[PDB]
Amino acid sequence: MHELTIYHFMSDKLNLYSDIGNIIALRQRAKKRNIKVNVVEINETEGITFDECDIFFIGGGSDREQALATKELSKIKTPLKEAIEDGMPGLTICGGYQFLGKKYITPDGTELEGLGILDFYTESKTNRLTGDIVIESDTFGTIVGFENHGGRTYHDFGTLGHVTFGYGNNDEDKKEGIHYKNLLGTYLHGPILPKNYEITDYLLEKACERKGIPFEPKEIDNEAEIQAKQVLIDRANRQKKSR
Template sequence: MKLTIGHMYPDLLNLYGDRGNIIALKKRCEWRKIDVEIKEIKAGINENFADIDLLFFGGGSDREQKIVSEDLKSKKKNLIKAIEDGMPVLAICGGYQLLGEYYKTLEGNKIEGLGILDAYTVASNKRLIGNIVVEAHLFNKKFYLVGFENHSGKTFLRNCSPLGTVIIGYGNNGEDKKEGCVYKNVYGTYLHGPLLPKNPEMADILIETALSRKYGKINFEPLEDSIEQRAKEAFIKRFMKK
């Protein structure tokens, strides 16, 4: 089996170690003897997403988001088609915001998003920064996600489901205890760190979804993740006590 992982704008959207998510996906595939190709999708490159099995969208500053927003207009139709067809997507921070309706800056300017997620983001004077613990419910499973958030944008969901409930930290906006957003196989979140090395369950959801979409029913064997789980448990215990 082989997966092609698309990395959206790696030269523009790569804050807070987001590239580590690509490394984690690649290694967890290789440990299962799954071949992996990383395809970088940059500004000015036409992409129909037909050969992309799994897509990663990182975060960036307002300046980079404006550049990406303009370029996404040429990719919008094909990207939406792939998402509606079930392509799994992980979008972090700026990438998450750009999948929504818009991002409104402090100056009142709107950076247009793709409108795939029924959500919008507005800038604030306060940065929402620190360690975060989220209780997630996906595929009838409950598990914790841990990470680090650092964003001034506040995202508000309309008719879509959050990725999870904030236990420690701010999440989407620091007000409603919601973190992230889920639409079909798209997962938007503010968890940096990077997210996937700290949360192997989330990495495997993306990989298994991509494989099932491409190959149908598969035998997806779990990996030995005791070290990762102990690290997560230590993280949770440390910050839950505060």
């Protein structure tokens, strides 16, 4: 049977944003395509290669846990970058997405060094960007979710799409997340994969093409996912007409 291996980095206490729903969503959508997903939880980043890895996932946690995960992930900072530059698919949520750049500035000005895989920084404020967020993307279709983060990420890379309602990476850009090659990062909660099946299928489809296994069938039933998106889309437009 076709098999895809997911490397869940820092599964042990980096699980604030549920994160098992992203694993559940990846496994269910791949199961509909007759693909068995093997999730390999990795907490020891010493001597681990990326040969048997098809997709990797890096969740988010508290500011203290992110620094501890950054130190452990730094032990393979170069082989991870070469995998991403080679086109390794990956999804990172919040802290895992913020700690891919150079540094993270807390509201008190304390700089915490990041992994440095990409050239960008994050500046946090007290007032958070909180509320429902609706995104219109060319690759991932309509992305719907909920944002709640104080850190403002500034990067000149490809984003997940334009923000029609909400804020996104910061107050002004009206762009959410990052999309560098096959690597994805976001601030969305829910999780993001359950409703946004087009993001799940993107990560699964890209891994299949790299491995050489069929991604069939490509179009499956998505009614439950679409009905969940429409609730927040209708609510976003209802509040949008008041502004």
